[PDB]
Amino acid sequence: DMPIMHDGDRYELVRDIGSGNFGVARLMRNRADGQLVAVKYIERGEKIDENVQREIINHRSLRHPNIIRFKEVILTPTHLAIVMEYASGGELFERICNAGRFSEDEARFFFQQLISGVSYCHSMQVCHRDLKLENTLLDGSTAPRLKICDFGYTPAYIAPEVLLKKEYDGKVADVWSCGVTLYVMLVGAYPFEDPDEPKNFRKTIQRILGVQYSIPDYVHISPECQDLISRIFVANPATRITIPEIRNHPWFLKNLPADLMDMQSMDEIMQILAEATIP
Numbered sequence: 001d002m003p004i005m006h007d008g009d010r011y012e013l014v015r016d017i018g019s020g021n022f023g024v025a026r027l028m029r030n031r032a033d034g035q036l037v038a039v040k041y042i043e044r045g046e047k048i049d050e051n052v053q054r055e056i057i058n059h060r061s062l063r064h065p066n067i068i069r070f071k072e073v074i075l076t077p078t079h080l081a082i083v084m085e086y087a088s089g090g091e092l093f094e095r096i097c098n099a100g101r102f103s104e105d106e107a108r109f110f111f112q113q114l115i116s117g118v119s120y121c122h123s124m125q126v127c128h129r130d131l132k133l134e135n136t137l138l139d140g141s142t143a144p145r146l147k148i149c150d151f152g153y154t155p156a157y158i159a160p161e162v163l164l165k166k167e168y169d170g171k172v173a174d175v176w177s178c179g180v181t182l183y184v185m186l187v188g189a190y191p192f193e194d195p196d197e198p199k200n201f202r203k204t205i206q207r208i209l210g211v212q213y214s215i216p217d218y219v220h221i222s223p224e225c226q227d228l229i230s231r232i233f234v235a236n237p238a239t240r241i242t243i244p245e246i247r248n249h250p251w252f253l254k255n256l257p258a259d260l261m262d263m264q265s266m267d268e269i270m271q272i273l274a275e276a277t278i279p
Contacts, residue, residue: 002026002041003078011037020091021135021149027086036086037071040153041079045279048080052153053273056082059151060269061124065259066117067150068137072264073272080276087147089138093184101188104221105255111182112252113146116260118174119243121150128170133157133177155204156180156190160235163205172237175246179232187219191233211235224251 002024005013014027014036026039042048059070074081089095092110096102102110114136121131131148134157138144159176161168183191191213193204207213211233215221221229228251231241246252264272 003076006076006081007074021132021137022086028083036088037083038086040082040084041076042082042153042276043079043279044276046277048273048276052080053270055152056269056273057266058124059084060266062121062150064117064120066113066146066148067120068147070151073269073276075272075275078279080273082153084151085139085147087137087139089140089144092136092138092146092181095138095144096185096188099188101219102185104186104225107182107185108251108255110146110185111178112256112260114148114178114181115243115246115252117146117148118178119247121148122171122174122243125171128173131174131177133174133181136181154190154193154198155201155208156192158205158208159237160209160211161237163209169237171243172240175232175240175243178246179229182229182232183213183215186221186225187215209235222251224249224254227251 002016005026010031011028012031014029016026017038018024022038022040024040026041028037028039029035030037042052056070056073062069068087069085071083071085074083099106114133118131118133121129129150130152131150133148134154135149137147137149139147157177157180159168159173162173180191189195192207194200197203213233215226215229228241228246228249232246234240241249
């Protein structure tokens with residue numbers, strides 16, 4: 001369930017949705033600025049706990065263009081409403097499918113945004129967070145802004161060490177994921193996974209563990225691009241290229257935009273969350 005529509009003076013109801021990265025959510029248009037927002041609802045009472053509070057505070061702290069940004073919490077008679085930015089250009093993956101594959105320059109356009117967002121997320125973490133890299137979103141149709149869904153309310157993406165080791169560095173596993181996104185942009189399909197046997201997980205995992213992939217002969221990529229890919233897809237996390245090293249890689253640096261180079265008070269939010277614990 002979702003409660004009835006509310007705050008109609010500030011928001012227009014666009015549509016209630018039931019799937020995708022926002023799950024069960026309400027899409028709204030802000031009447032003041034015209035921006036689309038996704039609203040998630042949590043029932044008032046026992047569900048409003050310290051986890052919710054931390055998730056909200058964490059979310060709120062993320063101020064970077066390539067992350068889905070928190071807007072506000074609103075108290076309703078029956079639910080806490082969590083309002084955040086909505087990405088209206090679909091999934092990155094669907095844009096790749098539509099294109100067949102991206103050119104090197106288009107892949108770079110998105111990869112620069114991805115890495116920048118991931119580097120930002122990493123800089124704000126005390127612990128690894130599932131950034132949902134398998135499903136990044138796009139905002140806008142033309143020159144789309146990539147959106148990572150750093151919030152929470154195919155096995156091709158899993159790095160070898162995530163399967164094999166008791167302990168692993170989550171940031172280094174994210175590098176592998178970024179490489180999987182780069183590959184799918186350049187090739188038009190996932191590496192490792194058999195396109196005719198997508199649910200043969202065992203087969204995909206054995207290929208991950210062996211780092212068994214190839215870029216098709218008809219896909220021509222520059223040496224700098226090959227260099228980046230080869231340095232991401234190494235099984236040993238200790239030898240994998242790091243995010244700072246990617247940010248200084250010549251393929252990443254080429255055509256880097258100037259921007260990528262180099263609200264309620266917390267008091268109000270906390271008071272709303274406190275009130276929301278009462279049904």
